[PDB]
Amino acid sequence: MENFQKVEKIGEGTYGVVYKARNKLTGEVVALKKIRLPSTAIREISLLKELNHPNIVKLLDVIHTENKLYLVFEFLHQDLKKFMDASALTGIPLPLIKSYLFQLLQGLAFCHSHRVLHRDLKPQNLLINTEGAIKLADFGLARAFGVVVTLWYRAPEILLGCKYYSTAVDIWSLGCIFAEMVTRRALFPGDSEIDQLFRIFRTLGTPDEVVWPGVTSMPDYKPSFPKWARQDFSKVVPPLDEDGRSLLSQMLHYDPNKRISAKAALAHPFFQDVTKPVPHLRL
């Protein structure tokens, strides 16, 4: 490429393919995303170059040349999906899960404070380094770009066809990730939209107007949905302690309005004893 050298493919993302690349000018190694194909998107994604935080993957540049769009991001060597796969025999140690959740909530709290949502959080867009940091990639892209991608972290309001999003969608996705770090299994591994919704309903109970006022008027709500009873979190995420289960409960409320904010979640007793351990990362 004119301005970069292509080191290797790191992976397919929602809005396009990602390469590890070297900047010719500087020698720095970056993650270069080629957007799969809009003047709207360019100014809105360009605003994200100013959205800098220790727990957000830094958008270094937006490159619009030859009628193609590339996003240049800071490079990190591993994602949480790979790290959880690598950790599956022992599990991620609790103090590191706690550290990772705490840092991800700080990144969300920052983005949400700037009125930026993610909307598609998943383990593949959570990047880790050797220093014990975790960072969120791809904040703000879903709003700017619009429309087999994983459903597993999709808040129920999205699955029920609500055409508007709130900060709560990101808390829901993070709660699902928290559960999966603890149990070493995805919480809701749906392989279709209705399977996703019904896996949620089978665990949390079918929602109703008592726990979620307004649910029965959402666009894809059907009165014919089966009525499942709600399971105890003690069954769902053993052996997480009552602090962890209380926080997870709050992140997985049905009503987006009842779901804990990132800000409030940082103050939860679960994080009384948070620390920042060194992960064992084989690269």
Side-chain angles (χ1 to χ4, degrees), residues 117-271:
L117 310 189
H118 192 300
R119 310 182 180 184
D120 190 27
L121 286 168
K122 60 201 158 196
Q124 310 99 275
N125 56 30
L126 302 184
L127 300 186
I128 60 175
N129 67 23
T130 58
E131 320 279 327
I134 188 164
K135 304 193 183 194
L136 302 119
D138 292 359
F139 260 88
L141 295 189
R143 180 171 192 277
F145 289 134
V147 82
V148 177
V149 175
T150 190
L151 295 175
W152 296 357
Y153 308 98
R154 295 249 186 308
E157 58 273 35
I158 311 176
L159 294 168
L160 284 177
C162 293
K163 258 356 168 169
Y164 43 88
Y165 295 85
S166 81
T167 56
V169 302
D170 288 337
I171 291 292
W172 175 278
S173 299
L174 190 55
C176 290
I177 296 172
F178 176 26
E180 181 168 350
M181 284 195 282
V182 169
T183 62
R184 315 184 211 161
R185 282 188 70 176
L187 183 58
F188 304 127
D191 63 348
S192 73
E193 287 189 57
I194 201 61
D195 184 58
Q196 188 65 40
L197 197 62
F198 287 179
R199 283 173 176 271
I200 297 167
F201 291 0
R202 287 190 278 257
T203 301
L204 303 180
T206 304
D208 59 22
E209 287 286 339
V210 166
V211 299
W212 191 351
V215 65
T216 65
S217 296
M218 295 246 183
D220 298 337
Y221 177 85
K222 306 301 175 173
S224 59
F225 287 154
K227 291 207 186 48
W228 287 284
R230 158 185 215 111
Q231 300 193 333
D232 269 277
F233 274 103
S234 64
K235 173 186 174 67
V236 188
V237 293
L240 189 64
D241 62 45
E242 180 53 69
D243 287 318
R245 291 193 315 262
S246 170
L247 174 58
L248 180 61
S249 185
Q250 302 190 114
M251 299 178 81
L252 296 184
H253 282 315
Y254 269 120
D255 184 354
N257 298 281
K258 298 202 180 80
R259 214 171 283 150
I260 195 170
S261 69
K263 173 175 166 153
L266 287 171
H268 190 285
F270 184 63
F271 295 115

Side-chain angles (χ1 to χ4, degrees), residues 4 31-33 35 38-50 58-65 68-73 141 145:
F4 295 89
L32 183 66
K33 175 187 279 47
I35 302 311
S39 297
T40 321
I42 298 273
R43 182 187 152 269
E44 181 166 359
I45 302 167
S46 295
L47 290 179
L48 294 175
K49 289 190 290 171
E50 305 317 300
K58 168 181 175 56
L59 178 61
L60 293 164
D61 220 334
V62 173
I63 300 173
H64 182 204
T65 60
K68 299 293 151 273
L69 186 59
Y70 308 86
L71 307 185
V72 187
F73 291 97
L141 295 189
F145 289 134

Side-chain angles (χ1 to χ4, degrees), residues 97-133:
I97 294 178
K98 184 171 297 198
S99 179
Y100 279 175
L101 184 61
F102 191 67
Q103 289 182 66
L104 292 166
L105 284 165
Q106 292 180 79
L108 266 65
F110 177 76
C111 292
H112 293 174
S113 75
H114 287 288
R115 300 172 249 91
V116 178
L117 310 189
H118 192 300
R119 310 182 180 184
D120 190 27
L121 286 168
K122 60 201 158 196
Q124 310 99 275
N125 56 30
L126 302 184
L127 300 186
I128 60 175
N129 67 23
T130 58
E131 320 279 327

Side-chain angles (χ1 to χ4, degrees), residues 261-282:
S261 69
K263 173 175 166 153
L266 287 171
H268 190 285
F270 184 63
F271 295 115
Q272 178 83 346
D273 63 356
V274 68
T275 67
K276 189 179 171 182
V278 177
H280 169 44
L281 302 172
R282 177 188 73 76

